[PDB]
Scaffold this active site. Structure first.
Site, PDB file in Angstrom:
ATOM      1  CB  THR A   1      -2.862   5.048  -1.952  1.00  0.00           C
ATOM      2  OG1 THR A   1      -4.127   4.650  -1.411  1.00  0.00           O
ATOM      3  CG2 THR A   1      -2.242   6.073  -1.040  1.00  0.00           C
ATOM      4  CB  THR A   2       0.569   3.561  -5.812  1.00  0.00           C
ATOM      5  OG1 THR A   2       0.562   2.744  -4.636  1.00  0.00           O
ATOM      6  CG2 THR A   2       1.990   3.673  -6.328  1.00  0.00           C
TER       7      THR A   2
ATOM      8  CG  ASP B   1      -2.219   0.728   0.975  1.00  0.00           C
ATOM      9  OD1 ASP B   1      -2.941   0.364   0.026  1.00  0.00           O
ATOM     10  OD2 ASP B   1      -2.523   1.667   1.740  1.00  0.00           O
TER      11      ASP B   1
ATOM     12  CG  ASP C   1      -6.332  -1.036  -0.268  1.00  0.00           C
ATOM     13  OD1 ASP C   1      -6.519  -0.267   0.697  1.00  0.00           O
ATOM     14  OD2 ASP C   1      -5.387  -0.901  -1.072  1.00  0.00           O
TER      15      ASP C   1
HETATM   16  N1  LIG Z   1      -5.995  -7.796 -13.538  1.00  0.00           N
HETATM   17  C1  LIG Z   1      -5.475  -6.626 -13.978  1.00  0.00           C
HETATM   18  N2  LIG Z   1      -5.057  -6.482 -15.253  1.00  0.00           N
HETATM   19  C2  LIG Z   1      -4.540  -5.326 -15.702  1.00  0.00           C
HETATM   20  N3  LIG Z   1      -4.394  -4.230 -14.938  1.00  0.00           N
HETATM   21  C3  LIG Z   1      -4.774  -4.233 -13.641  1.00  0.00           C
HETATM   22  C4  LIG Z   1      -5.348  -5.460 -13.076  1.00  0.00           C
HETATM   23  N4  LIG Z   1      -5.630  -5.194 -11.788  1.00  0.00           N
HETATM   24  C5  LIG Z   1      -5.269  -3.908 -11.549  1.00  0.00           C
HETATM   25  N5  LIG Z   1      -4.755  -3.341 -12.652  1.00  0.00           N
HETATM   26  C6  LIG Z   1      -4.262  -1.951 -12.767  1.00  0.00           C
HETATM   27  O1  LIG Z   1      -3.123  -1.744 -11.936  1.00  0.00           O
HETATM   28  C7  LIG Z   1      -3.129  -0.391 -11.485  1.00  0.00           C
HETATM   29  C8  LIG Z   1      -2.448  -0.264 -10.132  1.00  0.00           C
HETATM   30  O2  LIG Z   1      -3.276  -0.747  -9.081  1.00  0.00           O
HETATM   31  P1  LIG Z   1      -2.665  -0.777  -7.596  1.00  0.00           P
HETATM   32  O3  LIG Z   1      -1.408   0.052  -7.617  1.00  0.00           O
HETATM   33  O4  LIG Z   1      -2.581  -2.198  -7.100  1.00  0.00           O
HETATM   34  O5  LIG Z   1      -3.769   0.023  -6.748  1.00  0.00           O
HETATM   35  P2  LIG Z   1      -3.348   1.307  -5.878  1.00  0.00           P
HETATM   36  O6  LIG Z   1      -3.083   2.369  -6.915  1.00  0.00           O
HETATM   37  O7  LIG Z   1      -4.557   1.552  -5.016  1.00  0.00           O
HETATM   38  O8  LIG Z   1      -2.130   0.867  -5.108  1.00  0.00           O
HETATM   39  C9  LIG Z   1      -4.580   0.048 -11.455  1.00  0.00           C
HETATM   40  O9  LIG Z   1      -4.705   1.340 -12.047  1.00  0.00           O
HETATM   41  C10 LIG Z   1      -5.321  -0.972 -12.295  1.00  0.00           C
HETATM   42  O10 LIG Z   1      -5.928  -0.323 -13.412  1.00  0.00           O
HETATM   43 MG   LIG Z   2      -5.166  -0.765  -5.468  1.00  0.00          MG
END
Ligand SMILES: Nc1ncnc2c1ncn2[C@@H]1O[C@H](COP(=O)(O)OP(=O)(O)O)[C@@H](O)[C@H]1O
Ligand SMILES: [Mg+2]
Ligand SMILES: Nc1ncnc2c1ncn2[C@@H]1O[C@H](COP(=O)(O)OP(=O)(O)O)[C@@H](O)[C@H]1O
Ligand SMILES: [Mg+2]
Lengths: 528, 532, 56, 52
Positions: B87-88, B54, B391
């Site tokens: 958040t990232t 996170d 989350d």
């Molecule tokens: N199964 C998937 N296939 C392709 N892209 C994905 C998948 N799951 C999440 N993503 C993309 O990865 C990006 C980063 O998500 P993540 O960094 O885990 O969430 P956060 O930004 O809350 O930490 C998101 O913008 C999402 O669009």
């Molecule tokens: Mg996420």
């Protein structure tokens, strides 16, 4: 003073990349290599020097790992894994560390190439599911009503410990303790080896004199010599409230103006003590046990009714006595009832062992708690014996809760590895290589057994693999004392399915957890 | 000449310093984006270990000194508080926006023009998202919530077990549904108690159809299981009575002292007798219970729990229909307890979990509650499980509240980049450049996603942009707006069909917050650092 | 607390019991509070909207 | 220090003894509601007051 512009703190250290993954994997490998030689019936013990001045002599993985302080967080994770394995099932502590190290090694092999850790993690999870399925497939049931088979299971559990010389005595003690502490109330079954089934170690004597008591033994003496030190069929009353006059909660200053009020107040203190003692005596007991103090006047009034009194007993000990003798602890003596009196203890006796007095209540009919009296050479020997008995009792409880049984001596490892290898032939993807690698990583247990036995690792392991390629050889393992292949349905080394399942799950999830890290940040203030 | 006891940085120096700080904060967490991102393991000065993915947790645990970096960290914290996800992404977007804005400023473009262009671009991006890229969840059914949970839990420790964890999350969220005034359903997340216990594998985590208490019975003599529970919730201690500071006991006739001391505990005895006489089986209190009252409950054959947390007690009372009582005082000046104050549950059990015991209140009536017990290999893994689970719960709550979702995998960013690059030519002359830079900076998300997978980021982003340009230009190719990134195979993919969804609120709030933070940092052109 | 050369009144083989008693008898060590040895973890602290609410 | 502002806004008159607590010293308002700011805090708004 001089001000350098900074984003993070001066004492903040950050490293990332292949170096972090390699460091984590080598830390896990080193943790495994620390206790690699403490696995098997021919394991060698280790001396651990406490920072407090104590000495720990053991071959149990959890004690060795908990006695070692490390700086690398991967090693801390591995030690936490060891503690989790010890707390969950109570056995397989050394095996899980070695398995995690081997899985992380075979993962590092792929991470050296251009394979992403997530692919390895997915392959590992698929492999873990297949291992669980195979273990449940090759297991066999046990008859809990069969005392001989339960004793054999406990023996095969304790053949790798220092207590294996007195195998029959230890197995009988563990089985009897677990069986009698087993309880059932309100439709909820429980064992509760932690609270009841207390182990008391008294240095001196011979270990062949160790036994499980049909009741509870405490390190206490009567409050006054005129007390009876031997009662045939005592009626026991347990209390928490003190038997002495005490101050109230509120500020209660007195104001004495008349001459006789002082002596009157003292007389009413004595009368209150007498009233409490009479309320206790109304139930006609023989023994009174209190978690708190008993006044001298209370002792006198209890003597007038010929009642033995013991004071300042720990709450856990008092609960154990209540379970053993079938009594209920009562706080207010005026609220004592007949069913609160503990009848069922068939003997109470205070005898002197060495230069100390010990109180024995050891003839109970159907006791739900026990004291395992351990006598031996010294304190460290008895500590190791207690650890071994704890392992035996944990294994007995695991078998009682789950009557599934799994072949030991590395036979289950080889069977699961062969099944997973055969299953991997029909996937034709990129995940087949990590799947097969983590499948074959289970062979580190038979290899470790052969290495500790002193036999030829390569020839024996090749022969074992070839045997397991056959059609019914799932129970073929290695004899850890002679270094030869043997069928485990003939040798008789069997282990609970719960222990194996926990070991595999914990090892695979440790590998998965340590495979997800590529960045390390350290040195920042706790901020709280 | 100024004679100020401090250091002063002005103009390009301070602008570059702020951009460097923001870029460093972004680069710290850029490696933890997307399903191919990897976790970070942080060690305190006292040896405490935290393994997390996170962004908010990482930026909170980090000790930061630069004011712009602090602004970015607080931006991540605010995004976590108001949305719970992305958040990232918000930090990365804000840092990229600041970097491109500074690049524009270095070309003698006035910062006010850049700020105006950024505001216009953010407004138009929000409008375009709301009008073109949203998908109504009414036609998708329950599978939309499962897909959103799966997308949220990717890149987390529970990603591979998503097939199980998504069902768990959806059931937990649906178990706490209620409708407030105006008939709007609400989903009070953080009412789902999460208990962490090392032990068995992840797949053996339990979803409790009721409530889970991190507490045990007060005395060993109490039963550990009650079938038809009548829960009484109290907000006061059950101990020996003591008079307040303003009341004093002065004895002149000695004969009264024994009666005083007897009543001192008879008061609590009578209170407990009333509470037990109403028929209660389980008694939960936020205060303590001493030995005498424990023995009263033991003799009554009832379960008594002490030092229960206030939030846990409130949740249990409202789930079971009980009423919190801070005193047994009625409107008639008497001391009474009524059966109408008793909650009910189908079972109350003290179960063993890895050599430890906790209390489960199963199937509370008049309201459904949910609790989750997470099983892991050790404490750090359970902590990461809890963070990822929170989350996912927040994502599902956002999806259920606002019934619009957007495709994931960088499809929204690419579509916005193409649309804003087209739209910049119709506004101003230098705010045109600002909007173009906004559109270009929006592409940092798919670029980082592709980089984390060691894929060809340039070629994949070019293909995505070509697909979205074809979607925007051609009128019958509107189905290409859902083309995102498939990081497993490194190819573009229709993410709406693949099930990669996000709540629209995540993208909208991330855009707005990142734009505001970038504007705030860009507003600085002079720093005076007073000496302490 | 102004303890210097504690070895004079503690020796060289003093254990934790000796130091505990020695600190207690000057009344500087806070009184011992009974606590759970080990259990499962919860790790939650209030916050907002952390309230189940009856449907209406 | 907020008593003056509150009394001016609502129209309430402070009461320092229960003997003088009467209905004529109360401030009538249309709505007194506690609102939350999307998880960023809680505010208490008293909007709409007779004789504002
Ligand atoms: N199964 C998937 N296939 C392709 N892209 C994905 C998948 N799951 C999440 N993503 C993309 O990865 C990006 C980063 O998500 P993540 O960094 O885990 O969430 P956060 O930004 O809350 O930490 C998101 O913008 C999402 O669009
Ligand atoms: Mg996420
Ligand atoms: N007589 C034996 N012959 C061969 N292998 C044995 C024998 N007894 C025990 N083992 C093996 O040794 C292992 C137990 O080693 P142990 O020292 O208890 O490690 P752990 O504490 O991790 O279980 C079991 O997996 C079992 O298969
Ligand atoms: Mg063993």
């Amino acid at each position: 003073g001089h001000r350098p512009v900074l984003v993070l703190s001066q004492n903040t250290k950050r490293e990332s990349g292949r170096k972090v993954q390699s460091g984590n994997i080598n830390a896990a490998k080193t943790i495994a290599d620390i206790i690699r030689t403490c696995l098997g019936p021919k394991s060698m013990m280790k001396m651990l020097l406490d920072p407090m001045g104590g000495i720990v002599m053991t071959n149990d993985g959890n004690a060795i790992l908990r006695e070692i302080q490390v700086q690398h967080p991967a090693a801390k994770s591995m030690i936490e894994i060891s503690r989790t394995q010890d707390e969950e099932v109570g056995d397989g502590t050394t095996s899980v560390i070695i398995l995690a190290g081997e899985m992380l090694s075979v993962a590092e092999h792929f991470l050296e190439q251009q394979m992403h850790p997530t692919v390895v993690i997915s392959a590992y999870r698929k492999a873990l599911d297949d291992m669980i399925s195979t273990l449940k497939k090759i297991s066999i049931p046990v008859d809990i009503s069969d005392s001989d088979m339960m004793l054999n299971i406990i023996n095969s559990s304790i053949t790798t410990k220092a207590i294996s010389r007195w195998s029959s005595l230890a197995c009988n003690i563990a089985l009897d303790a677990v069986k009698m502490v087993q309880f059932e109330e309100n439709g909820r079954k429980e064992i509760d080896i932690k609270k009841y089934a207390r182990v008391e170690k008294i240095p001196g004597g011979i270990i062949e004199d160790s036994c499980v008591l049909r009741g509870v033994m405490i390190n206490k003496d009567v409050t006054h010599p005129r007390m009876r030190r031997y009662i045939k069929n005592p009626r026991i009353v347990l209390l928490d409230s003190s038997l002495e006059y005490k101050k109230g909660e509120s500020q209660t200053d007195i104001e004495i103006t008349r001459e006789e009020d002082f002596t009157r107040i003292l007389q009413m203190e004595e009368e209150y003590i007498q009233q409490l003692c009479e309320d206790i005596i109304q139930l006609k007991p023989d023994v009174v046990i209190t978690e708190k103090g008993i006044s001298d006047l209370a002792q006198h009034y209890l003597m007038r009714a010929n009642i033995t009194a013991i004071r300042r007993v720990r709450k856990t000990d008092n609960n154990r006595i209540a379970r053993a003798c079938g009594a209920r602890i009562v706080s207010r003596p005026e609220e004592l009832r007949e069913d609160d009196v503990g009848t069922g203890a068939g003997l109470l006796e205070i005898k002197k062992i060495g230069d100390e007095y010990f109180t024995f209540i050891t003839d109970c009919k159907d006791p739900k708690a026990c004291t395992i009296l351990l006598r031996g050479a010294s304190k460290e020997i008895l500590s190791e014996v207690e650890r071994n008995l704890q392992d035996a009792m944990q294994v007995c409880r695991n078998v009682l809760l789950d009557p599934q049984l799994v072949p030991g001596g590395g036979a289950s490892e080889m069977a699961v590895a062969h099944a997973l290898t055969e299953k991997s032939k029909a996937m034709t993807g990129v995940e087949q290589w990590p799947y097969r690698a983590v499948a074959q990583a289970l062979e580190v247990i038979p290899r470790t057994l052969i290495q500790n036995c002193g036999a030829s690792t390569i020839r024996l392991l090749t022969s074992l693999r070839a045997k397991h390629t056959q059609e019914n050889c799932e129970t073929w393992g290695v004899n850890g004392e002679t270094g030869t292949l043997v069928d485990m349905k003939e040798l008789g080394i069997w282990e609970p399915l719960a222990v194996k399942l926990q070991t595999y799950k914990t090892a695979v999830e440790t590998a998965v957890l340590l495979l997800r890290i590529d960045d390390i940040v350290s040195g920042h203030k706790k901020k709280g | 000449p100024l004679s100020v006891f401090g250091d002063r940085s002005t103009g390009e120096t301070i602008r570059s310093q702020n951009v460097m700080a923001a870029a460093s904060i972004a680069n710290i967490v850029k490696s933890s984006l997307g399903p191919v991102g990897l976790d970070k393991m942080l060690v305190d000065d006292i040896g405490d270990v935290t393994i997390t993915n996170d962004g908010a947790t990482i930026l909170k645990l980090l000790e930061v000194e630069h004011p712009a970096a602090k602004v970015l960290c607080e931006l991540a914290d605010l995004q976590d508080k108001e949305v719970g996800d992305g958040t990232t992404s918000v930090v990365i977007i804000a840092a990229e926006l600041l970097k491109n804005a500074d690049e524009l400023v270095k070309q003698k473009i006035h910062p006010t023009s850049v700020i105006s262009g950024y505001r216009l671009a953010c407004k138009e991006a929000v409008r375009y998202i709301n009008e073109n890229l949203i998908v109504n969840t009414d036609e998708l059914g329950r599978d939309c919530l499962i897909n959103a949970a799966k997308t949220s839990m990717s890149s987390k420790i529970i990603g591979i077990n998503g097939d199980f964890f998504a069902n768990m999350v959806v059931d937990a969220v649906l178990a706490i549904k209620y409708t407030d005034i105006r008939g709007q359903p609400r989903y009070p997340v953080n009412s789902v108690n999460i208990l962490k216990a090392h032990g068995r594998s992840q797949m053996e985590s339990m979803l409790i159809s009721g409530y889970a208490l991190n507490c045990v019975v007060g005395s060993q003599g109490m039963p550990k299981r009650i079938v038809n529970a009548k829960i009484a919730c109290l907000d006061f201690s059950l101990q020996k009575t003591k008079m307040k500071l303003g009341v004093q006991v002065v004895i002149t006739d000695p004969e009264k002292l024994d009666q005083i001391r007897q009543r001192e505990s008879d008061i609590t005895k009578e209170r407990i007798q009333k509470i037990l006489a109403t028929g209660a089986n389980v008694i939960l209190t936020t205060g303590g219970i001493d030995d005498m009252c424990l023995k009263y409950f033991v003799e009554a054959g009832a379960m008594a729990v002490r030092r229960v947390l206030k939030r846990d007690l409130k949740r249990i009372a409202k789930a079971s229909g009980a009423t919190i009582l801070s005193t047994l005082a009625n409107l008639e000046g008497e001391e009474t307890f009524e059966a109408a104050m008793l909650g009910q549950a189908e079972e109350v059990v003290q179960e063993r979990i890895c050599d430890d015991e906790l209390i489960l209140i199963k199937n509370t009536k008049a309201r459904t509650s949910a609790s989750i017990i997470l099983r892991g290999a050790n404490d750090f893994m359970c902590d990461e499980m809890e963070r990822s689970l929170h989350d996912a719960l927040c994502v599902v709550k956002r999806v259920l509240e606002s019934k619009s979702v957007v495709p994931g995998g960088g499809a929204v960013e690419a579509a916005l980049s193409i649309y804003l690059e087209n739209y910049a030519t119709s506004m101003g002359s230098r705010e045109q450049l600002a909007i173009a830079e906004f559109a270009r900076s929006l592409l940092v998300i798919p670029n980082t996603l592709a980089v984390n997978a060691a894929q060809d980021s340039t070629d994949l982003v070019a293909k995505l942009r070509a697909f979205h340009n074809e979607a925007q230009v051609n009128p019958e190719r509107k189905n290409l707006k859902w083309i995102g990134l498939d990081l497993s195979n490194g190819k573009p993919r229709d993410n709406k069909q693949a099930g990669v969804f996000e709540p629209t609120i995540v993208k909208v709030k991330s855009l707005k917050f990142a734009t505001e933070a970038a504007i705030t940092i860009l507003r600085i052109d002079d720093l005076i650092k007073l000496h302490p | 607390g102004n303890f210097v050369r504690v070895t004079d009144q503690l020796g060289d083989d003093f254990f934790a019991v000796d130091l505990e008693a020695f600190l207690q008898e000057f009344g500087l060590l806070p009184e011992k509070e009974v606590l759970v040895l080990t259990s499962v973890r919860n790790s939650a602290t209030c916050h907002s909207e952390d309230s189940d609410l009856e449907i209406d | 220090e907020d008593i003056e502002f509150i009394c001016k806004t609502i129209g309430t008159k402070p009461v320092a003894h229960i003997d003088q607590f009467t209905a004529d010293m109360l401030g009538s308002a249309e709505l007194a509601e506690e609102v939350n700011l999307n998880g960023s805090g809680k505010l208490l708004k008293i909007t709409g007051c007779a004789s504002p």
